[PDB]
Design an enzyme around this catalytic site. Sequence first.
Site, PDB file in Angstrom:
ATOM      1  N   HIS A 169      -3.670   9.592   7.484  1.00  0.00           N
ATOM      2  CA  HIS A 169      -4.460  10.446   6.474  1.00  0.00           C
ATOM      3  C   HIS A 169      -5.419  11.521   6.864  1.00  0.00           C
ATOM      4  CE1 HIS A 169      -2.412   8.835   2.978  1.00  0.00           C
ATOM      5  NE2 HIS A 169      -2.379   7.798   3.528  1.00  0.00           N
ATOM      6  N   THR A 173       1.974  10.011  11.023  1.00  0.00           N
ATOM      7  CA  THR A 173       3.204  10.200  10.314  1.00  0.00           C
ATOM      8  C   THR A 173       3.477  11.883  10.180  1.00  0.00           C
ATOM      9  OG1 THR A 173       4.133  10.163   8.194  1.00  0.00           O
ATOM     10  CG2 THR A 173       2.165  10.563   7.947  1.00  0.00           C
ATOM     11  N   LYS A 209       3.454  13.297   5.574  1.00  0.00           N
ATOM     12  CA  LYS A 209       2.364  13.720   4.660  1.00  0.00           C
ATOM     13  C   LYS A 209       2.098  15.022   4.727  1.00  0.00           C
ATOM     14  CE  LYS A 209       1.573   8.641   3.527  1.00  0.00           C
ATOM     15  NZ  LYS A 209       1.912   7.384   4.286  1.00  0.00           N
ATOM     16  N   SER A 251      -6.968   5.885   2.788  1.00  0.00           N
ATOM     17  CA  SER A 251      -6.353   6.551   1.455  1.00  0.00           C
ATOM     18  C   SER A 251      -7.142   6.113   0.204  1.00  0.00           C
ATOM     19  CB  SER A 251      -4.995   6.269   1.407  1.00  0.00           C
ATOM     20  OG  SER A 251      -4.748   5.212   0.514  1.00  0.00           O
ATOM     21  N   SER A 279      17.858   1.035  15.623  1.00  0.00           N
ATOM     22  CA  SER A 279      17.875   1.698  14.204  1.00  0.00           C
ATOM     23  C   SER A 279      18.146   3.145  14.830  1.00  0.00           C
ATOM     24  CB  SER A 279      16.654   1.703  13.544  1.00  0.00           C
ATOM     25  OG  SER A 279      17.182   2.277  11.975  1.00  0.00           O
ATOM     26  N   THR A 280      18.900   3.803  14.041  1.00  0.00           N
ATOM     27  CA  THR A 280      19.540   5.176  14.189  1.00  0.00           C
ATOM     28  C   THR A 280      18.286   6.009  14.214  1.00  0.00           C
ATOM     29  OG1 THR A 280      21.462   4.766  13.172  1.00  0.00           O
ATOM     30  CG2 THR A 280      20.848   7.004  13.389  1.00  0.00           C
TER      31      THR A 280
HETATM   32  C1  LIG Z   1      22.641   0.009  13.756  1.00  0.00           C
HETATM   33  C2  LIG Z   1      22.698  -1.040  12.584  1.00  0.00           C
HETATM   34  C3  LIG Z   1      21.733  -1.518  11.758  1.00  0.00           C
HETATM   35  C4  LIG Z   1      20.740  -0.487  11.311  1.00  0.00           C
HETATM   36  O1  LIG Z   1      21.285   0.846  10.899  1.00  0.00           O
HETATM   37  P1  LIG Z   1      20.352   1.853  10.513  1.00  0.00           P
HETATM   38  O2  LIG Z   1      20.741   2.585   9.270  1.00  0.00           O
HETATM   39  O3  LIG Z   1      20.391   2.701  12.076  1.00  0.00           O
HETATM   40  O4  LIG Z   1      18.758   1.443  10.854  1.00  0.00           O
HETATM   41  C5  LIG Z   1      21.983  -2.695  10.761  1.00  0.00           C
HETATM   42  N1  LIG Z   1      22.924  -3.681  11.020  1.00  0.00           N
HETATM   43  C6  LIG Z   1      24.100  -3.476  12.073  1.00  0.00           C
HETATM   44  C7  LIG Z   1      25.132  -4.296  12.188  1.00  0.00           C
HETATM   45  C8  LIG Z   1      23.778  -2.441  12.852  1.00  0.00           C
HETATM   46  O5  LIG Z   1      24.665  -1.966  13.664  1.00  0.00           O
HETATM   47  C1  LIG Z   2       1.527   6.015   3.982  1.00  0.00           C
HETATM   48  C2  LIG Z   2       0.885   5.216   5.093  1.00  0.00           C
HETATM   49  C3  LIG Z   2       1.645   4.779   6.197  1.00  0.00           C
HETATM   50  C4  LIG Z   2       3.124   4.991   6.218  1.00  0.00           C
HETATM   51  O1  LIG Z   2       3.773   6.309   6.408  1.00  0.00           O
HETATM   52  P1  LIG Z   2       5.084   6.605   6.348  1.00  0.00           P
HETATM   53  O2  LIG Z   2       5.457   7.580   7.286  1.00  0.00           O
HETATM   54  O3  LIG Z   2       5.481   6.904   5.058  1.00  0.00           O
HETATM   55  O4  LIG Z   2       5.958   5.248   6.465  1.00  0.00           O
HETATM   56  C5  LIG Z   2       1.115   4.247   7.252  1.00  0.00           C
HETATM   57  N1  LIG Z   2      -0.338   4.194   7.464  1.00  0.00           N
HETATM   58  C6  LIG Z   2      -1.148   4.694   6.284  1.00  0.00           C
HETATM   59  C7  LIG Z   2      -2.679   4.612   6.435  1.00  0.00           C
HETATM   60  C8  LIG Z   2      -0.655   5.270   5.176  1.00  0.00           C
HETATM   61  O5  LIG Z   2      -1.091   5.508   4.095  1.00  0.00           O
END
Ligand SMILES: *Cc1c(COP(=O)(O)O)cnc(C)c1O
Ligand SMILES: *Cc1c(COP(=O)(O)O)cnc(C)c1O
Lengths: 396, 395
Positions: B217, B245, B248, B189, B277-278
Amino acid sequence: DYNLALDKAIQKLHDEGRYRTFIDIEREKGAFPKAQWNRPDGGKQDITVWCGNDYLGMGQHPVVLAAMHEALEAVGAGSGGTRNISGTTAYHRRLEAEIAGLHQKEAALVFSSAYNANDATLSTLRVLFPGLIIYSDSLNHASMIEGIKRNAGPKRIFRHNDVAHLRELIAADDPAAPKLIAFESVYSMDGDFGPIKEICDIAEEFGALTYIDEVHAVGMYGPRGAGVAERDGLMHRIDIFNGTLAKAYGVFGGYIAASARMVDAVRSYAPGFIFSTSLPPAIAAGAQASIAFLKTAEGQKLRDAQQMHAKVLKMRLKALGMPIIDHGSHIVPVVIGDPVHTKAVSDMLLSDYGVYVQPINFPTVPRGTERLRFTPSPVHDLKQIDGLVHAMDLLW
Amino acid sequence: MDYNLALDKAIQKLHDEGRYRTFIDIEREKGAFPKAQWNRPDGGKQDITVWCGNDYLGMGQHPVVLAAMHEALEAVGAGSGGTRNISGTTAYHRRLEAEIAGLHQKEAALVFSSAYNANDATLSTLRVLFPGLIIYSDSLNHASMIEGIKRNAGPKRIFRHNDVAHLRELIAADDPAAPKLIAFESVYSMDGDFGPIKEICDIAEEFGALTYIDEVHAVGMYGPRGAGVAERDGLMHRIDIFNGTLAKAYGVFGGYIAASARMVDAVRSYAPGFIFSTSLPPAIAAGAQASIAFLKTAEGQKLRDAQQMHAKVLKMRLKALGMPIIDHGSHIVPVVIGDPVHTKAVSDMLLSDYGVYVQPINFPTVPRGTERLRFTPSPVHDLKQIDGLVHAMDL
Ligand SMILES: *Cc1c(COP(=O)(O)O)cnc(C)c1O
Ligand SMILES: *Cc1c(COP(=O)(O)O)cnc(C)c1O
Ligand SMILES: [Cl-]
């Protein structure tokens, strides 16, 4: 042979009975907890979602959705950058202000997720406080564990909710070293409460920072949904709050809330904050609207309904003689204790009764504690509860 | 100890080094990109033009992307309500992963909350899946890749930027039995340079290493279908894992990997960053998929063509003025200033005086003496406003 290694890694999961099969659903907005199940045979079946984290049904709330539709029409689909490079918008600052206000803190910082908030913040705290010893509850979420282990540094794991053990560990350490105690207000899988007051007492005695993950409490506890610390009047004793916008708030994203110094330092040093695209404005708009609504008396009505439905579900299931673990929260775990049978029960509930409760296994819960986790919400009326119970009775 | 003092020292240190960053608060105007309203720190309001954004093709305001997002919100609501395991797997995630797989001509794809998370989660998990893995990393690799590579413990080798001889030498020196992966980018970039993809695949092939390429990119912007620089060069079949990604050039949010079904299944089964994670909101997933499919068509090609011309036009017009341009053949236009005070003075000027928003880039983000403004010309930056910017940049 890279392919052999991959095959072995995957087989190990099957051998341990913990290979996970995802269920493809489409929730029906305006009719939660109804969803369409897209079955593997190509069919479509109406189901009731019983295991989701959109605890208060805010994902379909008109004030949330209205705000999201408006934002999309005002500024478009995404931010188009990082917070540093064109991705800081009014929607981000207003959101951060709402969150800070929720926790009665000076400042707040939004991340892509609460997972990222925890991992980035905890790891960056080691940089900001050289020699930091992190004291961590043995059942802490993966995001916290990962952040704690990320940067090299001292860690001490205390037995779950065991403050005598925590005291034993903290007292043995160098009193000059900086210290932080990381724990949860509500633990995701057992549905038990962290001993916030006792931990804060230890932290004040030993001169440690307190870091609380209220991801399973925000929106749901306290008179404005600020969490269990708010419910118990201990908010002022917490140094850093971690929460999510993706569960009871019904949208997406995560945060920390803390002093202006703490937030300014983290945002200036955490790579996970700096080097990633900021949350879409529409997400930020929806989340803010959700937080604001849940701070009101109308929001309190959803909390009251959730608690009432949770209580009733628990009564009904105990009445069957289900193995339900009841720690007094909104979470309703039924422990099967075998990953394969848990999947079998879940599979039969889905296919024969239209009840969707995902089987929960390692690494989400310890081996031998595999379970079904019911998340009754205000949209799960007494008739749905009846229908679930009946299905569970028939199934045994 | 004194925690607030420690925080004070951390902040003051940035102020002392001139690297404390002040966020500018903007709201882009949908339907009128590159226009935005600047919410100035003194309370004032002013229209500006965004010239340093990563929504490279203006897809953030595209009617097909937005149509898909509004529909999805009305069909299924605000978010997913869970992790991919716990109620968060939707037809929107599935169709998105199918569209991405197809873009890269791989068996599968895996979406994450962001490409930062995709890189961090994937590279760290691969050390678990391939015990003893050595990762060969380009010195200019993005933070996310660096963090993934260092996350879990294990051997790593940093090769000098684009230096395939240094890479050869490092790899030939290592245990021949050890699992090996070479991690790099297609387009970097800051400088806008291209990675030497063919020659890194040659080495990978010679030494039995996996290839991991970040096309963040390049996706949306290169190749006949916007699949990236490896597509443009006919090398996609020689890449094991693509990182990309959706945030972008695709104009939305999120990230992914694309690889074989065994690779994806393993990563999704082992990476805590995937598991805990959600999942992406279905509306984001609808939007991203619509953007991708649109950019695979001839109509998307027209967008890439336009970007390329604008970039080409801005570079020539600035060179014709006598300005110093780091020109490596990409859509990125870095203008070199050589000192951090004069860099910030030009961006403060551009913003204050003409409404041109281009962030300054000084040390430690680039070496001392390479200080510069990074311009990201887009199909929405017409020939007349490029004219305006050239005329403005007459000091
Ligand atoms: C699901 C969870 C997270 C992460 O939440 P996201 O917003 O989904 O990344 C963090 N802490 C606890 C206790 C969770 O259950
Ligand atoms: C911006 C960037 C990322 C991260 O992408 P997000 O989807 O914004 O987290 C990863 N690799 C390169 C080379 C980037 O420039
Ligand atoms: Cl130690």
